[PDB]
Design a protein around this nucleic acid. Structure first.
Lengths: 157, 162
DNA sequence: GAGTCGATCGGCGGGATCCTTA
DNA sequence: TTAAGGATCCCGCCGATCGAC
């Protein structure tokens, strides 16, 4: 993180372009400025199905563990899509995903952020299983997965 | 003179737009922020506004919204960017019996009315009260749009989606 | 932070419905 | 006095405390 200094007026302006909770000046600015090959949908769907059946997935003991492994895998399938599916995802006061731990600790608290393996992202953990499904569902819907797959996946969390 | 954070990548992007040595990052941004508003489509003519309101309805963002208040906000937010002055004159003539609807600051809306749950319209100096049924939220859009010289039919469509 | 997960439950926001005011 | 506008209040959704291991 690097630092620049803006005058009082220009500051209020950027501040007024705030859309949703927890976004940074960086976020807001890139929006105000207009500032890769991927696997097929079938291949994506296959990978997720393989995962649900995979041994690794059964070995995961608790929800939070499946939750994480699900995110790692989703991200590996389409970084761009995951990013988009994730940047608009948050709660009333808590930010759900961030590119660093501090942002999550700063906005929420006791959110128990964990870094998502094989991923530049951190996500909050202090949530019930239900809300974990909501996040996964919302993400997969955004990433354009079949409704029936999303259903089968949330049933395993 | 206040301080803000910028990811290292953007910092390199803003720096590269220096047009003379020594000028503040303020001046630079002011250049971009104002002159990059020109890469955006026109909104001067009615036809351009119609095309603009049309894009909003057809947009992914407007579609993601699940609440009425949220669609409500995107509308105000967009209507303002079509014509600043027009939005203002349509605003002043828009109020209730005891409640002020639009104000430049939060306190004013918490002063005249109460339990109004006022929010801030993004990309705008304005604040709006939210504690209102859907129909009234429409009436407000109705007014603002009727005042900004929008065709009747389009107004009805827009209000239908709130 | 650091023992870890996550269900229960207080609490807030959305906005229909009910109430007030002129 | 009925319309027009205010704002109470129920339900659903979010946060995070604290119980269960």
């Amino acid at each position: 993180m690097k630092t620049i200094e803006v005058d009082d007026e220009l500051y209020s302006y950027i501040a007024s372009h705030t859309k949703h909770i927890g976004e940074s000046r960086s976020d807001i600015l890139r929006r105000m400025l207009k500032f890769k090959p991927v696997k097929t949908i079938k291949d994506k769907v296959r990978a997720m199905r393989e995962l649900l059946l995979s041994d690794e997935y059964a070995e995961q003991k608790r929800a939070v563990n499946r939750f994480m492994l699900l995110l790692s895998t989703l991200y590996s399938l389409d970084a761009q899509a995951f990013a988009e599916a994730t940047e608009s995802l948050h709660g009333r006061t808590r930010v759900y995903f961030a590119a660093d731990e501090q942002t999550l600790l700063k906005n929420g608290n006791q959110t128990k952020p964990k870094h998502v393996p094989g991923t530049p992202y951190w996500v909050i953990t202090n949530t019930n299983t239900g809300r974990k499904c909501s996040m996964i569902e919302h993400i997969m819907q955004s990433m354009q997965f079949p409704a029936e797959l999303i259903e089968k996946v949330c049933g395993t969390i």
